[PDB]
């Protein structure tokens, strides 16, 4: 039971701007001033003219927070959602996610030059022992009685954050 504490492993967030340029590098600064760490740019897989993107160009920027800073950014991100989410936002494999339209509602002042960017919070819920699938030597599977389910992760959102899950 103590080794089954449904904790959060990582809180992944990304800013998917249109294309590269001065708008992207100013969007990456939004994440490093929100997460406290330099984010990583994401290139486009293919070339799509209807989206204005081509191959091997930085069109998005993302970051990953693990420790107690992850649940702090998640707390600020759920304030914008008023501590309530839908039901379909939870995946059948445990973890869930949501979205924020304006990053100014996360505890920072708006800069007139840096336009208001929208991010995408996806928290990867976990459990002590999930690192056996990540280590190289003796990499093992989690198992059925240890992996997180959808309704099991929803009750975690209703107890830790007193959240309201809309049907």
């Amino acid at each position: 039971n103590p080794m089954r504490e449904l904790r959060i492993r990582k809180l992944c967030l990304n800013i998917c701007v249109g294309e590269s340029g001065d708008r992207l590098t100013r969007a990456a600064k939004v994440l490093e001033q929100l997460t406290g760490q330099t984010p990583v740019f994401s290139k486009a897989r293919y070339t799509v003219r209807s989206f204005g993107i081509r191959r091997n160009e930085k069109i998005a920027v993302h970051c990953t927070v693990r420790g107690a800073k992850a649940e702090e950014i998640l707390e600020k991100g759920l304030k914008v959602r008023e501590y309530e989410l839908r039901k379909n936002n939870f995946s059948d494999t445990g973890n869930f996610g949501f979205g924020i339209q304006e990053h100014i509602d996360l505890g920072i002042k708006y800069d007139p030059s840096i336009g208001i960017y929208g991010l995408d919070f996806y928290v990867v819920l976990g459990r002590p022992g999930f690192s056996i699938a990540d280590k190289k030597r003796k990499t093992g599977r989690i198992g059925a009685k240890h992996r997180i389910r959808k309704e099991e992760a929803m009750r975690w959102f209703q107890q830790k954050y007193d959240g309201i899950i809309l049907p």
């Binding site: 190289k136 030597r137 003796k138 990499t139 093992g140």
Partner: protein
């Protein structure tokens, strides 16, 4: 959604090797490491195996055979309490002593322990034992790092340093020893001697007491109850290095003849396996 694990999936499926499915053996690295040249004709190709658990360090020397490689000599890190090291049995300093134990124990059973003493006094600098003309050649083997990422400072190179200081002729370079600066490509010796004698552990024991003595009792709980303080770290490992070079031979434990009581249950026989179905069928027919 179409199922990917159908009958045709398992029919066409080819399982990996057992040691590969378990994630223990890298056969790409093993082929280049244990296979002897064909113009050697059973010349044993030795290798030093260094493996780490969460609580123990294993140092082994083996040569590959068709029926399974034979372990020549083996030295464990839980044998160090016999020599003085009661705690920290998985640090870089214990790896040096576990490798030094393997080097002095192998040369003892091969009868050439008087020759090839290595470095009795530790300098941390580059050292390679050389064979003396007229005397039997030095034992040459190779490092089997396994799946450990060979980064500069990995404890597999501590056991490597302990073995080359014990008299083993293992080819290596000082690039992966703790104290090799990558931007200047220079190797400093005395900083490597700190990790060997546990001086980097003593600095951590001191800064914890000067900052948060509550965190010091949590990090080094068994260090303080065993009488191992930060000021006696360097000398504790030095006494073990002297004690290992004096009595490296391992004394096996007498096997205790027991009742041979197997705990877990055995497989159900074909009669029990069929009767269980016959009972479930009868129970399903009574309910209807």
């Amino acid at each position: 959604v179409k199922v990917v694990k159908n009958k045709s999936y398992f029919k066409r499926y080819q399982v990996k090797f057992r040691r590969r499915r378990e994630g223990k053996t890298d056969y790409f690295a093993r082929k280049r490491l244990v296979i002897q040249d064909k113009n050697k004709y059973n010349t044993p190709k030795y290798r030093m195996i260094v493996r780490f658990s969460n609580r123990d360090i294993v140092c082994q020397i083996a040569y590959a055979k068709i029926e399974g490689d034979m372990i020549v000599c083996a030295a464990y890190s839980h044998e160090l309490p016999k020599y003085g090291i009661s705690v920290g049995l998985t640090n870089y300093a214990a790896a040096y002593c576990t490798g030094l134990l393997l080097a002095r124990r192998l040369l003892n059973k091969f009868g050439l322990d008087k020759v090839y003493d290595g470095q009795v006094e530790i300098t941390g600098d580059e050292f390679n034992v050389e064979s003396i003309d007229g005397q039997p050649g030095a034992f040459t083997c190779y490092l089997d790092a396994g799946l450990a990422r060979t980064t500069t400072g990995n404890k597999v190179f501590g056991a490597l340093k302990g073995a080359v200081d014990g008299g083993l002729s293992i080819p290596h370079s000082t690039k992966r020893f703790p104290g090799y600066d990558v931007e200047s490509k220079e190797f400093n010796a005395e900083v490597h001697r700190k990790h060997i004698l546990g001086l980097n552990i003593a600095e951590y024991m001191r800064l914890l007491m000067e900052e948060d003595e509550e965190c010091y009792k949590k990090q080094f709980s068994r260090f303080i109850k065993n009488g191992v303080t930060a000021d006696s770290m360097e000398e504790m490992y030095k006494k073990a290095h002297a004690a290992i070079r004096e009595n490296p031979v391992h004394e096996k434990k007498p096997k205790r003849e027991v009742k041979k009581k197997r705990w877990n249950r055995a497989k159900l026989t074909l009669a029990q396996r069929k009767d269980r179905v016959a009972q479930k069928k009868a129970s399903f027919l009574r309910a209807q």
